[PDB]
């Protein structure tokens, strides 16, 4: 079966009435199945829409509006899935098919359109107008012997769901990769995604991974792995592209840094941004819009901050900055420069590397800490040097108790909080240093893995006066807080999942909360051993 992407332009018109039709044909030419919506609009009179005879199915919605053509031959349209709706809850909407020229739509022969799978219908302003898992009709009592499936299809077969990628192994209590499993390309179960398509994080085969996800490769097949946090978005820095003749980050350009994670260039924050420059028709920047930069984790060039919100205590907007590569440097010298700011702490608690270029922290009369860092740790290139000059004296900073926290290591801090330490004196929980992990007390219970506390599995049972786990897994528990499926603490026994031989496996609860196998005869559930279960 031939497949086209579809369209979602709505009542939009693509160019001249001729340009609109010329682009409608190229998409829906020889197409048999529409993955998206079938949108027929602004079709003029005497325009041959005869290529629409090939269409056998539509997944999304169908739209026929503002057409003055006499005939729209949908003589083979067998099904409308209604994956989407056009407006409100109309899966099929045929609206205002006429013109002020006295020529509307006469013939809409949808002779084969038996079922609409989802959604209602809307008709207005048109003056001239069997198995168990099947859908349209049936050329037999079986499932294969059906015209079109209801849910999915898998080589003639009309299943309600595609064969799972994995099947529960009742032996080792683990999962195994199903050799009969297939991806869900449209309402079809294909053993492999088609040409130039990508696997979802679960199941289907789509051309675009989309947001919150990126494209990774696994077993020769490009898949769509979810983005750990915001997806990576490279962006141009000051001086480049959008900001060619730009002097600083200003109220104008600040918006374009939205959702950026990596800056390909430099980053300048100068006082002119806060004053505004009439000579460039640039208004004052409101400091709050700096929060946009919180998504920035890396900078290829340098970071220059000569101006900063006086009421803001630290470089908050860079709390997530991880690295400055210093591939480009101020005066060929500096990769980090912070001069004459009101801040009290730098606050770069996520900074772990400055690959090249020198550091200059100068004139911040209230700036404490800063001298506690051993910047050698951050440097990657030799000859890199720091200059920390004319900021607030250590002794003044002591008098007001602005010193690295007691849980910080001697390596220093970016500020007074435990989450500002460079490294921890004992252990860390999250991005925070602490005294001890919750081994024998506290919520949640956890275990240590390299100077770090890690939450025990929530299915492990807290032991008074002892530990509760040894590893991230539920197999590493000591006592299962609820049920047990072999080496596995569980909140519910396995009941309904598929297995080998294409049989849904069932389990029940032994009074010791241990999951055991029901009798094979019991297929819809069971609450005990023997036949008496079901």
């Amino acid at each position, epitope marked *: 079966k031939k497949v086209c992407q579809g369209t979602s332009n709505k009542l939009t018109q693509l160019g001249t009435f001729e340009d609109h039709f010329l682009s409608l044909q190229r998409m829906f030419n020889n197409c048999e199945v529409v993955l998206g919506n079938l949108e027929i609009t602004y079709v003029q009179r005497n325009y041959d829409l005869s290529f629409l005879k090939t269409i056998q199915e539509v997944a999304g919605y169908v739209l026929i509006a503002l057409n003055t053509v006499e005939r729209i031959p949908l003589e083979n349209l067998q099904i409308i899935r209604g994956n989407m709706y056009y407006e409100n809850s109309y899966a099929l909407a045929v609206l205002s098919n006429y013109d002020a020229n006295k020529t509307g739509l006469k013939e809409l022969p949808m002779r084969n359109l038996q079922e609409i799978l989802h959604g209602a219908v809307r008709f207005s302003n048109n003056p001239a107008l069997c198995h168990n898992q099947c859908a349209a009709g049936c050329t037999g009592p079986r499932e294969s012997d059906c015209l079109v499936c209801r849910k999915f299809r898998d080589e003639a077969t009309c299943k309600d769901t595609c064969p799972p990628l994995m099947l529960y192994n009742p032996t080792t209590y683990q999962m195994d990769v199903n050799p009969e499993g297939k991806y869900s390309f449209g309402a079809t179960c294909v053993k492999k995604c088609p040409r130039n398509y990508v696997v979802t994080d679960h199941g289907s085969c789509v051309r675009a991974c989309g947001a919150d996800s990126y494209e990774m490769e696994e077993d020769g097949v490009r898949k769509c792995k979810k983005c750990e946090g915001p997806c*990576r978005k490279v962006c141009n820095g000051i001086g480049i592209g959008e900001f060619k003749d730009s002097l600083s980050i200003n109220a104008t350009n600040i918006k374009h840094f939205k959702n950026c994670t990596s800056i390909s260039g430099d980053l300048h924050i100068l006082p002119v941004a806060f004053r505004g420059d009439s000579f460039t028709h640039t208004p004052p920047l409101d400091p709050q819009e700096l929060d946009i930069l919180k998504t920035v*984790k890396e900078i290829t060039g340098f970071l220059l901050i000569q101006a900063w919100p006086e009421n803001r205590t630290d470089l908050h907007a860079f709390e997530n900055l991880e690295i400055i590569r210093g591939r480009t440097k101020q005066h060929g010298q500096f990769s980090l420069a912070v001069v004459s700011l009101n801040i009290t702490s730098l606050g770069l608690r996520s900074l772990k590397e400055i690959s090249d270029g020198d550091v200059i922290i100068s004139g911040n009369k209230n700036l404490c800490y800063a001298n506690t860092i051993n910047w050698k740790k951050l440097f990657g290139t030799s000859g890199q040097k720091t200059k920390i000059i004319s900021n607030r004296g250590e002794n003044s900073c002591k008098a007001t108790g602005q010193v690295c926290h007691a849980l910080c290591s001697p390596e220093g801090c970016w500020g007074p909080e435990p989450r500002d330490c460079v490294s921890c004196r004992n252990v860390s929980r999250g991005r925070e240093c602490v005294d001890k992990c919750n081994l024998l007390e506290g919520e949640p219970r956890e275990f240590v893995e390299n100077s770090e506390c890690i939450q025990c599995h929530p299915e492990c049972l807290p032991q008074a006066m002892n530990i509760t786990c040894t590893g991230r897994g539920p197999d590493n528990c000591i006592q299962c807080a609820h049920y047990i499926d072999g080496p596995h603490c569980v909140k519910t026994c396995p009941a309904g999942v598929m297995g080998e031989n294409n049989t849904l496996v069932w389990k029940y609860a032994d009074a010791g909360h241990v999951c055991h196998l029901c009798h094979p005869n019991c297929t819809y559930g069971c609450t005990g051993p023997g036949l008496e279960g079901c």
Partner: nanobody
Amino acid sequence: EVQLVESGGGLLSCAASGRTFSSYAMGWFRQAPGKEREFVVAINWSSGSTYYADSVKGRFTISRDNAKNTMYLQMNSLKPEDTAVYYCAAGYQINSGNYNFKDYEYDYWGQGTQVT
């Protein structure tokens, strides 16, 4: 601090010491006399995922020896169509990878191992 020691080539080893290469990604680049420098191989350090170039695909083999901090490369079944100078590179990555390798960044480079 970050030193890349190259040793093994002529008519391939990259010993990388200097810091915690936890989120790092090291690879190998090449430059031909009368052209630009070009990708050849790369390998994430954690995990040990791997990415090859097309011409390099199959005909090469890269690996990582943890703890020893070294990145080896095999140039088995080479050809006159692959003669150039070879640099091993290294770079910190934003999230230990988890984005396309063609957009990885490299800050530290080796000296220059010859291959004729």
